[PDB]
Amino acid sequence: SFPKYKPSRLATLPATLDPAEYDISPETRKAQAERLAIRSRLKREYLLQYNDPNRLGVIEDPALIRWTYARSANIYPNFRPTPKTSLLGALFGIGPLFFWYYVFKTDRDKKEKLIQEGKLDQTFNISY
Amino acid sequence: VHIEPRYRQFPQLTRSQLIQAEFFSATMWFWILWRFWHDSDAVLGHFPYPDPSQWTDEELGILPDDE
Amino acid sequence: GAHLARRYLGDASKEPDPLRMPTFPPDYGFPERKEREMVATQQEMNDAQLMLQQRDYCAHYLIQLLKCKRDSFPNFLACKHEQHDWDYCEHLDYVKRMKEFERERRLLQRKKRREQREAEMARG
Amino acid sequence: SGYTPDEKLRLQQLRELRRRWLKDQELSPREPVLPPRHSIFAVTHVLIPVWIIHYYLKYHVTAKPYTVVERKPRIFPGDTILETGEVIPLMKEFPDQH
Amino acid sequence: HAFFKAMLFMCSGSIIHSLNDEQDIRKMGGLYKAMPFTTTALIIGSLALTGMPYLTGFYSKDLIIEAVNMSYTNAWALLMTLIATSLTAAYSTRIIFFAFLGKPRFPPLV
Amino acid sequence: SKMELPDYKQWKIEGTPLETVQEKLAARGLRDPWGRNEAWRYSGGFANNVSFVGALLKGFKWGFAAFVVAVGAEYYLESQ
Amino acid sequence: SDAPPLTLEAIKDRVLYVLKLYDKIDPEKLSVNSHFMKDLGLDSLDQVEIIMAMEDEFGFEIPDIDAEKLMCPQEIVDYIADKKDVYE
Amino acid sequence: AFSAPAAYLTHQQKVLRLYKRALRHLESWCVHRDKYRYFACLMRARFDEHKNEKDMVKATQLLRQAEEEFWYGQHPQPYIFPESPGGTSYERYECYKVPEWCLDDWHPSEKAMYPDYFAKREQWKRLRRESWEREVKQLQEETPPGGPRTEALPPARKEGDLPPLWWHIVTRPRERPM
Amino acid sequence: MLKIIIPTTMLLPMTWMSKHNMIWINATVHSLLISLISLSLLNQLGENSLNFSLTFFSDSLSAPLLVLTTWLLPLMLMASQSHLSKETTTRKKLYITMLILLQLFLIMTFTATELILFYILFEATLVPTLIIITRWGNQTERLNAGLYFLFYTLAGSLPLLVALVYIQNTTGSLNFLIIHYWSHPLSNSWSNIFMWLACIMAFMVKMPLYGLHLWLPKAHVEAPIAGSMVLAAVLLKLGGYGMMRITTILNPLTNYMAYPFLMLSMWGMIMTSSICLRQTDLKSLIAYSSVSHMALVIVAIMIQTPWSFMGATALMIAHGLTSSMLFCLANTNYERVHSRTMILARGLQTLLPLMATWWLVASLTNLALPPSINLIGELFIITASFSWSNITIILMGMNMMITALYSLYMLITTQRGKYTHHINNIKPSFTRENALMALHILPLLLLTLNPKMILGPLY
Numbered sequence A: 001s002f003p004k005y006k007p008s009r010l011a012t013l014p015a016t017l018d019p020a021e022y023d024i025s026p027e028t029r030k031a032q033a034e035r036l037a038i039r040s041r042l043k044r045e046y047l048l049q050y051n052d053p054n055r056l057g058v059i060e061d062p063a064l065i066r067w068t069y070a071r072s073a074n075i076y077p078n079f080r081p082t083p084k085t086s087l088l089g090a091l092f093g094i095g096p097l098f099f100w101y102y103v104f105k106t107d108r109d110k111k112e113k114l115i116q117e118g119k120l121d122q123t124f125n126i127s128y
Numbered sequence B: 001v002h003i004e005p006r007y008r009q010f011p012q013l014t015r016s017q018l019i020q021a022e023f024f025s026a027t028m029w030f031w032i033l034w035r036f037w038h039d040s041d042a043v044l045g046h047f048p049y050p051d052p053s054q055w056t057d058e059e060l061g062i063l064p065d066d067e
Numbered sequence C: 001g002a003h004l005a006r007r008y009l010g011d012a013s014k015e016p017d018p019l020r021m022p023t024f025p026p027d028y029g030f031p032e033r034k035e036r037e038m039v040a041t042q043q044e045m046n047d048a049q050l051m052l053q054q055r056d057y058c059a060h061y062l063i064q065l066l067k068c069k070r071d072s073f074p075n076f077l078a079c080k081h082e083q084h085d086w087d088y089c090e091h092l093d094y095v096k097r098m099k100e101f102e103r104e105r106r107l108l109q110r111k112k113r114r115e116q117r118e119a120e121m122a123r124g
Numbered sequence D: 001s002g003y004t005p006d007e008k009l010r011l012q013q014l015r016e017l018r019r020r021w022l023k024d025q026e027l028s029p030r031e032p033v034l035p036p037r038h039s040i041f042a043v044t045h046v047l048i049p050v051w052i053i054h055y056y057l058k059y060h061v062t063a064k065p066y067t068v069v070e071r072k073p074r075i076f077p078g079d080t081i082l083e084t085g086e087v088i089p090l091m092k093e094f095p096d097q098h
Numbered sequence E: 001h002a003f004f005k006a007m008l009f010m011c012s013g014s015i016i017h018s019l020n021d022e023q024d025i026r027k028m029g030g031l032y033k034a035m036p037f038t039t040t041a042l043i044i045g046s047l048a049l050t051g052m053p054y055l056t057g058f059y060s061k062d063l064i065i066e067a068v069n070m071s072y073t074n075a076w077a078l079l080m081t082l083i084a085t086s087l088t089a090a091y092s093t094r095i096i097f098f099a100f101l102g103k104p105r106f107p108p109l110v
Numbered sequence F: 001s002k003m004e005l006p007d008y009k010q011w012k013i014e015g016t017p018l019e020t021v022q023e024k025l026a027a028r029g030l031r032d033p034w035g036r037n038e039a040w041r042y043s044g045g046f047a048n049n050v051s052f053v054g055a056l057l058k059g060f061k062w063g064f065a066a067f068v069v070a071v072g073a074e075y076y077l078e079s080q
Numbered sequence G: 001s002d003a004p005p006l007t008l009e010a011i012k013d014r015v016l017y018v019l020k021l022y023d024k025i026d027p028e029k030l031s032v033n034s035h036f037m038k039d040l041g042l043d044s045l046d047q048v049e050i051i052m053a054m055e056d057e058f059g060f061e062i063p064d065i066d067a068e069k070l071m072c073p074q075e076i077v078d079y080i081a082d083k084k085d086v087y088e
Numbered sequence H: 001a002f003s004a005p006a007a008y009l010t011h012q013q014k015v016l017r018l019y020k021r022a023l024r025h026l027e028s029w030c031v032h033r034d035k036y037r038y039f040a041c042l043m044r045a046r047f048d049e050h051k052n053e054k055d056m057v058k059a060t061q062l063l064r065q066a067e068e069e070f071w072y073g074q075h076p077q078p079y080i081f082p083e084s085p086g087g088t089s090y091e092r093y094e095c096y097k098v099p100e101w102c103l104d105d106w107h108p109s110e111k112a113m114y115p116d117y118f119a120k121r122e123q124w125k126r127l128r129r130e131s132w133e134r135e136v137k138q139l140q141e142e143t144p145p146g147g148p149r150t151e152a153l154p155p156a157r158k159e160g161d162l163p164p165l166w167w168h169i170v171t172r173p174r175e176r177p178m
Numbered sequence I: 001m002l003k004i005i006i007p008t009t010m011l012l013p014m015t016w017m018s019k020h021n022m023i024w025i026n027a028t029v030h031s032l033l034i035s036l037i038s039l040s041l042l043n044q045l046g047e048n049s050l051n052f053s054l055t056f057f058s059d060s061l062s063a064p065l066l067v068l069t070t071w072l073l074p075l076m077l078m079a080s081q082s083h084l085s086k087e088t089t090t091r092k093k094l095y096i097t098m099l100i101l102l103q104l105f106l107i108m109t110f111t112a113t114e115l116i117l118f119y120i121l122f123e124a125t126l127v128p129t130l131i132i133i134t135r136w137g138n139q140t141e142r143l144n145a146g147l148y149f150l151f152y153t154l155a156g157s158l159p160l161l162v163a164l165v166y167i168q169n170t171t172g173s174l175n176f177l178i179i180h181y182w183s184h185p186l187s188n189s190w191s192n193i194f195m196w197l198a199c200i201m202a203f204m205v206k207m208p209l210y211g212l213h214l215w216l217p218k219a220h221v222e223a224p225i226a227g228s229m230v231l232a233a234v235l236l237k238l239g240g241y242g243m244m245r246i247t248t249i250l251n252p253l254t255n256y257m258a259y260p261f262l263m264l265s266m267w268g269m270i271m272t273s274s275i276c277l278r279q280t281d282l283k284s285l286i287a288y289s290s291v292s293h294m295a296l297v298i299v300a301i302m303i304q305t306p307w308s309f310m311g312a313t314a315l316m317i318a319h320g321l322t323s324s325m326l327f328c329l330a331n332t333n334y335e336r337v338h339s340r341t342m343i344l345a346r347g348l349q350t351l352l353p354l355m356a357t358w359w360l361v362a363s364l365t366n367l368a369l370p371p372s373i374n375l376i377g378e379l380f381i382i383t384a385s386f387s388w389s390n391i392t393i394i395l396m397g398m399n400m401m402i403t404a405l406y407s408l409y410m411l412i413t414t415q416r417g418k419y420t421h422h423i424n425n426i427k428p429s430f431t432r433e434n435a436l437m438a439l440h441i442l443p444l445l446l447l448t449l450n451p452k453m454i455l456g457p458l459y
């Protein structure tokens, strides 16, 4: 009836426009119940230590530790040389170097050639 | 100066603020009118704009299409 | 604008080019033309340090205005006659420039039409 | 719809506790027990800095060449120079387009 | 521009502080009579911003527009400058209309 | 200090644009049960307001009078 | 200075003021403990309208999950008193 | 914010939320009050027209179509209350919120001022310490074997009990602390 | 300059004979006095160096580095005694001995007249650093870090020694004065190319150069606070000193042998600045900032112009001070909450205002806010590079942006926002930490007042 909204990566789909939410099943309700049960168990575990009068210090969160360890120390053990990995590595690690090398070498060659013929307007170029 | 909440009424106004507001509006308008009366040309222009069509050929100096 | 409409939409061949003006010699149609004079000497303009753009043919009125503005400093409404005189000279200079542009227009159109007519007469 | 009796009772008890806590936040009359000329502003904030600055400029900065530079004053026809006493002539017999 | 821009912001700040830290113009009703001094100040500021003759905005904006018109300049820039100087008046009257005129729309505890 | 709310029964939709809204809703068979809640915005000192041109010409009368007296003083002062 | 120190009595008077201004609620019957569904005979849409009316009156939004639960003027008074740290 | 959420929203909750959102966005579109009342009465009639639909499938289809209409016609710049999550003063006073345990580290000279407040603070600390274990034991008995299934907490039932997990709810800093 | 060397050798037995509860006091007092004495080395000439004897001499490039080392020792002493309180007396004396030995080696390194004695001392600095890192580090990774610190250096420095002795057999001397006065050009041959590479790679890996920097985050993150301080502030500058010394005999080969290193340095400062934006570790961010600044210094030295040399010296000093301050600032929070994650403890401006002020000042100085000497060095390097090639202003410009971003990012995440609810062990800042921050920051602005003292011999 009206013009449609199509989602993208940086502007997602609204929850009220999602067809998956407008056709439900008892399995979906059961899954939502399990999700709430997990969330509530975690919240109770947190609130038990949060309100403790004898607790002094930091409540250790295993999820934060897992996130940091995955982001830093777990990357190399799970790395394999694949055509995608090797190609991306070669590109992203070598292409910029030779690109910038060609650019700067060409610029300096032009400048030196211009200097040799004596036409660069180097008057008042005392400091370098 | 003590002013108290009214709850769905017009707020309390002191005579001084209305006096000041009316005064400043009046002086702005007087300034505009006085500056227009004395400095009119600043808006309407000062020197008459000529029209090139009414310029005779003699002062302009081009030949009558022969030479 | 009407001159823009004429040049850009109509026949651009008989419309003057602002960057390239004038094309005809200054004494083409005039029998004799008086040389435009100045009043302010180079040393006077340099001492007054006017600007490189205000050193036009109306610079002497500007120097007079600057003098009166300096002398009657606290009374900053006293410099009325000289300001009007400078404005009038600038207006006359602009009128002279308008006359120059219009002369270029009429001369270009007249010469082009005369040349076309001569070619037509020689074509028959 | 609405609350359940457990929610209502818990809200009531928590609300009473919170109101008591807020009432305890008030200060008794003695709580902050602290333990044990006209135009002098223009002298200590304008006069003294300007004295120091003028002394520094007129006796230290201006002791070297090209430290304080002023552009040459404007000279106009008909002006008299202070040092030499010379006069500058007038301007070429104005056309008088009156 | 410094003068009337700063004063316009100050009038806006007075309006915001009075209406319990509210900044949306859709919740401001009739403040022409409720705020005499603030209304007068904002009116003078909007008129000065829009180049009302012989006010502080006229002596620069009028000259700027007239010097843009009389110059060997890009035509598109000239057209956009004119449309922008019209839209200035447009948003000025938008502020005035939605902030001062009409009936109140703010919460009842005045 | 120690201020109380006005009597709630004085708020009516008679003579207000809410009267027009109720009239158009009744012709459709509907009703508006919240008009009396909005009546305070039109009832009291907010009953009337100036227009846009009226707002622009706020201090026009006093300024014009001052300008006129100044011009009159100027005209009969150059006769010195 | 700033706004006065809002109290419970002021909140109750404002809530009752808003409610008595409703054409679907008769003033004499309405009390502080009246139930919107049972005693007053309204529906859920009317309760939503009532909640929006209180939001407009007090100038702060009540979340939907909390707004649906409020059923009597006393509940609304208690909620607003808790939200604005009102103890006297 | 104060209530424990549920596993899902039912049909009536979704319809009521759509009703509130549509009314708010229509108010954003209809700046003036009388026009808003007109179109809000129209919207209320539109909502209650299908109020008596016994086919749940068609009710969900109507709700869907209404949501698409709302997303198409919503205001790009709706009005938001200043202290609401999109408001101009949403988290303005959070930098002024200081926890109470900081008072535990004040110098004795700093505690010399305000003696009565710190006496009452010692009272409150003793009460919390004396109630903690009873709260913990009550929570254990009431809670189901397979862990809690909601975030709702129980009230006090005994003689001098306190509702468990109350210290950080009761001792909130303030809404306008400084 | 035995008047400076002997008092440190006497710091040794004074520390080892002090009473068990007076070690820190005596060490701090006498280190401060030695720094005051070493301040007299700044009286430099405009033509030549101060040749005290046949073994030691001082230029305008080494004197600020010596002053920095002498000033740094007491700062590490102050920052160390917090977490070493439970340690035994003998181990504390051993820790202070390690610091003193490192200072002695650095002092003799910065002033050796001959390249081989410079080599001996500049390798001798490796032992105390490795002992400190691998013994008094906190986590298990320290051991690996030590290895990465060791061989990365040695694999770079072992070829240099070879080249050095080879040079002695051809020119007959390694004395720096004779080397400078009898300099001869390098021909275009493969032998000369490999001699250049051998002479250059050690100081390249010490900076470190991009692609050779993997050891630096490990060493700087797993070390104790004094170890990180001395690693960032002084030990990174050994590469700069050595390269500015050794480049006198490599011309005109550098004219084309700097190209791969210049490319690596520029693109690597870009890459490390971008890396800093996504870093869950607070110490790793400071390590990568050090990498970026040292890349700028490498570019400056490779250009080989007077302005570049002055900028390199100024940036070396300024970065040393700033990085040391940042490490101490992060260590305070670590000592409070026992974690290095950057998003763990938030809203610390609410709880610790003066420490927030120190954080803001350190972050402002990091991003080269004028007229800080950081900005002076950065700007001199950028101007020299623009003279070298006009397109460099792109890459450098990019860096000048990204730096600021991550700088403010760190600040905004650690000081701003709302405080973490469950953390309630945050005690008010001690006098020791505040004095540490003040003694880090005040010399920076004092040097801003008189910046000719750190612009090098090209001034």
Ligand SMILES: CCCCCCCCCCCCCCCCC[C@@H](O)O[C@H](CO[C@H](O)CCCCCCCCCCCCCCC)COP(=O)(O)OCC[N+](C)(C)C
Pocket (backbone or CB within 6 Å): I188, I189, I190, I193, I209, I210, I211, I212, I257, I260, I261, I264
């Ligand atoms: C990860 C980062 C770690 C640090 C990396 C350090 C980078 C070191 C790179 C060394 C720079 C230059 C080395 C050699 C100089 C020139 C290189 C060559 O390409 O130039 C041409 C050389 O021509 C050909 O290229 C011959 C060389 C081909 C074989 C060299 C191996 C290159 C393959 C890449 C290996 C990667 C090395 C790094 C491994 C980690 C010049 O032509 P030519 O005029 O004839 O030779 C000049 C010398 N003459 C005058 C004596 C004759």
Ligand SMILES: CCCCCCCCCCCC(=O)SCCNC(=O)CCNC(=O)[C@H](O)C(C)(C)COP(=O)(O)O
Pocket (backbone or CB within 6 Å): G043, G044, G045, G046, H011, H012, H015, H016, H022, H025, H026, H029, H046, H047, H048, H049, H050, H051, H052, H053, H059, H060, H062, H063, H066, H067, H069, H070, H073, H074, H075
């Ligand atoms: C600004 C522009 C955007 C606005 C556009 C919005 C357009 C939407 C208009 C169309 C919406 C509809 O009619 S969709 C109408 C959907 N109809 C049904 O679901 C019938 C079943 N009845 C119930 O569920 C309950 O009775 C209930 C109705 C919830 C009442 O609950 P209470 O009695 O217990 O309070």
